[PDB]
């Protein structure tokens, strides 16, 4: 898009990928519903994070197992391998709290809510404020 | 002496050369593309793309100046803009829960402590409803006019004492509403008092029906405020503290987007060549400094590190580029009144720069005052020194022109001192010069200056005009007279230099026998026509006539007809004036018909008809203007001089002189320093205007159009 290429053979190639850009994604709604990330240990910013009805099918396939894949990301957003991870899990638990309200309830019983706000006022401005965005999501439920 | 190129240059390439170029450039490309489609134009899909970058970074510019912060990376800035927005939004969200969780907290604790009233009210008044709400204290008398018979006197409400305004359930900035109690009774009556009280809008809470309830309630929604609050608060804060980097970046994204922009426009205009696979540009550059074009490319290549290398040329064409000759600090005014009088071929000679020294030759023989003029020169030096400084504080309105002709001004004031000094008004007053006194009265000791001996001026003052001669009571209309005839003089000076600057354009302009054929008429005839009275003059300053003043010239032109001429200098002023004016009577024509005629041969002049006495009565007119100029700036000195005298010799005390100098100074400083010196300004820029008009270059023209940044350079 940015840069126009006379071949045509580029714009075919560029639908091609576009086309395996959207086979991989997917296949990776199927991860993303099942928690590959957290079963691997590492989290990175989820699209399915990102979507709040995305975010809550895959809470509710965690819900299936009564939040325990859900537990798992409350236990890695309170304490995280990588802050890129940390990162993460606070975004989606803001998404998941924003789409769901028993998210919300299971983030301040993980007590990571507190580290995230914390986490706000330290480094790492983008975690900054994906942490704000999270404290806004559990105040939004907490002011009457 | 600048001509058109055209170049091929491969795209990527030319992003290098054009983001060089961006900052002064040489070259600027038609537009092409856009006259033949500005939809999509060639890559304006590009354009509308930076254009949406620019708008995002408009947005967040504006934001910024909103939280007052110093002021892919598009997408970046778009999303942290965004964050901040969403950041504020919940802030504000916040702060309105806060607010009405503070009405049902004041509603409610209202309640508690007027419950004991309430049920003191009910057992003396008084199956029964409940009309709970709040009745506001600004409104009190509108609750208690409404619905009167509702109350039936059995119903009565415990109003809140109010005294601080309780904070509304929607509005944050709260108001001045008190929390009400009464009795229902009736269906009809019960809604109509829920219907008021929801039309009041003041702070209400349900009411419990045990106290302590109520007060817990409140205590609840009290602290909910309060957490809320204290929530949106830490999100303001780290909202702002993120966005003070956030304008750093877009302040820098300021001259980023210039450049994208510039970049995007540059492309939108030029048109690429698919053969080649070379973006195609054709822009016009100095021809003399496009030899430098070679180092641009080369960096371009090498930066983009692209073995292909294109080629830049220059073809020659029938259309004229337009381009101004180069413009230094000094320069830059005297380029700023030749764009004011329209513009001039490349090849037309453009006298701004005789204009730079001739403007403040006229105006400094126009008027000036030695006093302030040395003040206003001492002023615009300062302004010079401090440029620096003036640089970084932008100029308002008039003082930005200032600031571009502070060159101009000094040269002007610095001409107005040698003015004054011929003059002899330092500080707009006689000062002796050399002597004691620099003009006396020679004998009639005892004889009055209004004698027939009178004064005699036996010495005469070498630096300028006798003030005996000029400066004294009876002198001035001589002197006056005297005046107006230089500026005559001056001004055919003036038509004389037009007219060698028009020859020498001819020249330039390289013309065989089509020069001689229309110049040399419409030159030199007039010319010679002023040049036999400025002659005249000088004879009689030669021959020093008394009786007709200055107006001995006006008694010989008097007769156009031959015969007399009695008081001829000359001994044959008589017959070789008739033969002049038979000289010029034969010339007129030959200033209109020879060029026409050439015209016809090979293959405007009425115009040019009437055009010549119109000239010579123009110059006249600046003349006589110049003239008149100076006698008003003579006469505000000398009404200037006495006032101030008449403060001084009036007061014995120190304060009134004190007084009448201060405003004697003030009066004079706004007379003279604005008023008189921007007439004098003015008058003399008109002038300069009808010489150079009539002289040469006709407008006919543009500015030399590179592809500058506008806020790089």
């Excluded at chain 1, 928690?35 to 299936?64: A, Y």
Aim: with cysteine.
């Amino acid at each position: 898009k940015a840069q126009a290429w006379s071949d045509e053979d580029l714009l075919e190639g560029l639908n091609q990928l576009e086309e395996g850009l959207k086979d991989n994604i997917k296949r990776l709604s199927s991860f993303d519903k099942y928690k590959q990330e957290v079963l691997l240990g590492h989290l990175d910013w989820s699209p399915m994070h990102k979507d709040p009805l995305f975010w809550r099918d895959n809470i509710t396939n965690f819900e299936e197992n009564d939040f325990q894949i859900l537990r798992v990301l409350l236990t890695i957003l309170d304490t995280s391998s990588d802050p890129r991870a940390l990162a993460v899990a606070c975004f989606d638990l803001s998404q998941f709290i924003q789409y769901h309200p028993a998210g919300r309830v299971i983030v301040t019983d993980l007590k990571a809510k507190e580290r995230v706000m914390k986490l706000m006022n330290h480094e790492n401005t983008e975690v900054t404020k994906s942490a704000l965005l999270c404290i806004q999501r559990l105040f939004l439920g907490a002011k009457y | 002496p600048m001509q058109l190129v055209q170049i091929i240059i491969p795209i990527e390439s030319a992003h290098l050369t054009v983001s060089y170029l961006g900052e002064l450039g040489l070259l600027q490309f038609k537009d092409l593309n856009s006259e033949k489609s500005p939809f999509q134009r060639t890559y304006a899909a590009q354009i509308k793309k930076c254009a949406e970058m620019a708008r995002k970074l408009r947005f967040f510019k504006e934001q910024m100046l909103k939280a007052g912060i110093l002021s892919d990376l598009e997408v970046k800035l778009g999303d942290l803009e965004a964050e901040l927005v969403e950041i504020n939004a919940n802030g504000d969200k916040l702060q309105r829960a806060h607010s009405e969780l503070v009405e049902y907290k004041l509603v409610l604790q209202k309640a508690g402590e007027f419950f004991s009233s309430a049920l003191t009210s009910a057992a003396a008044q008084q199956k029964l409803g409940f009309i709970a709400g709040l009745v506001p204290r600004e409104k009190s008398m509108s609750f208690e006019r409404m619905l009167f018979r509702a109350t039936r006197g059995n119903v009565f409400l415990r109003q809140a004492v109010v005294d601080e305004p309780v904070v509304d359930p929607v509005s944050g900035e709260k108001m001045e509403k008190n929390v009400f109690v009464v009795f229902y009774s009736g269906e009809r009556a019960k809604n109509k008092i829920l219907k008021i009280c929801d039309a009041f809008g003041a702070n209400r809470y349900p009411f419990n029906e045990e106290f302590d309830k109520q007060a817990q309630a409140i205590s609840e929604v009290s602290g909910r405020l309060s957490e809320l609050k204290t929530t949106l608060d830490a999100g303001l804060l780290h909202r702002g503290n993120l966005l003070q980097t956030i304008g750093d970046q877009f302040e820098q994204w300021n001259l980023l987007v210039k450049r994208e922009k510039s970049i995007y426009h540059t492309l939108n205009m030029l048109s690429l060549d698919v053969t080649k696979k070379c973006l195609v540009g054709e822009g016009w550059s100095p021809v003399f400094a496009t030899k430098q074009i070679q180092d641009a490319l080369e960096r371009a290549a090498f930066d983009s590190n692209s073995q292909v290398g294109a080629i830049f040329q220059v073809l020659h064409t029938k259309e004229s580029p337009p381009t101004y000759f180069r413009t230094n600090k000094f320069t830059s005014a005297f380029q700023e009144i030749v764009d004011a009088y329209g513009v001039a071929k490349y090849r037309e000679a453009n006298p701004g720069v005789f204009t730079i020294v001739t403007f403040p030759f006229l105006f400094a023989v126009m008027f000036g005052d030695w006093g302030h003029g040395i003040c206003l020169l001492l002023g615009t030096l300062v302004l010079i020194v401090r440029e620096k400084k003036l640089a970084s504080q932008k100029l308002d309105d008039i003082t930005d022109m200032t600031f571009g002709g502070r060159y101009v001004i000094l040269m002007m004031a610095l001409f107005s001192i040698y003015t004054g000094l011929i003059y002899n008004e330092f500080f707009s007053v006689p000062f002796e010069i050399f002597s004691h006194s620099a003009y006396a009265c020679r004998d009639l000791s005892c004889s009055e200056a209004t004698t027939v001996g009178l004064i005699k001026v036996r010495d005469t003052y070498p630096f300028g005009v006798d003030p005996v001669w000029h400066g004294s009571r009876s002198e001035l209309p001589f002197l006056n007279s005297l005046k107006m005839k230089m500026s005559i003089l001056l001004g055919v000076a003036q038509m004389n230099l037009g007219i060698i600057l028009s020859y020498f354009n001819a020249t330039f302009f390289r013309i065989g026998v089509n020069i001689w054929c229309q110049f040399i008429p419409q030159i030199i005839f007039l010319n010679s026509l002023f040049g036999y009275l400025s002659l005249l003059i000088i004879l009689k300053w030669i021959t020093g006539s008394q009786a007709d003043l200055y107006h001995v010239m006006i008694y010989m032109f008097l007769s156009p007809t031959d015969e007399l001429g009695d008081n001829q200098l000359f001994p044959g002023q008589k017959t070789a004036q008739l033969v002049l004016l038979l000289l010029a009577f034969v010339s007129v024509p030959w200033m209109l018909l020879p060029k026409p005629f050439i015209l016809k041969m090979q293959h405007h002049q009425m115009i040019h008809t009437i055009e010549f006495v119109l000239g010579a009565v123009s110059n006249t007119a600046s003349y006589l203007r110049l003239w008149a100029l100076s006698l008003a700036h003579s006469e505000l000195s000398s009404v200037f001089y006495e006032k101030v005298l008449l403060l001084a010799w009036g007061y014995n005390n120190i304060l009134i002189l004190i007084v009448g100098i201060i405003v004697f100074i003030f009066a004079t400083v706004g007379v003279l320093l604005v008023m008189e010196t921007l007439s004098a300004f003015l008058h003399a820029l008109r002038l300069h205007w009808v010489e150079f008009q009539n002289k040469f270059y006709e407008g006919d023209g543009y500015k030399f159009s590179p592809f500058s940044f506008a806020l790089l350079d």
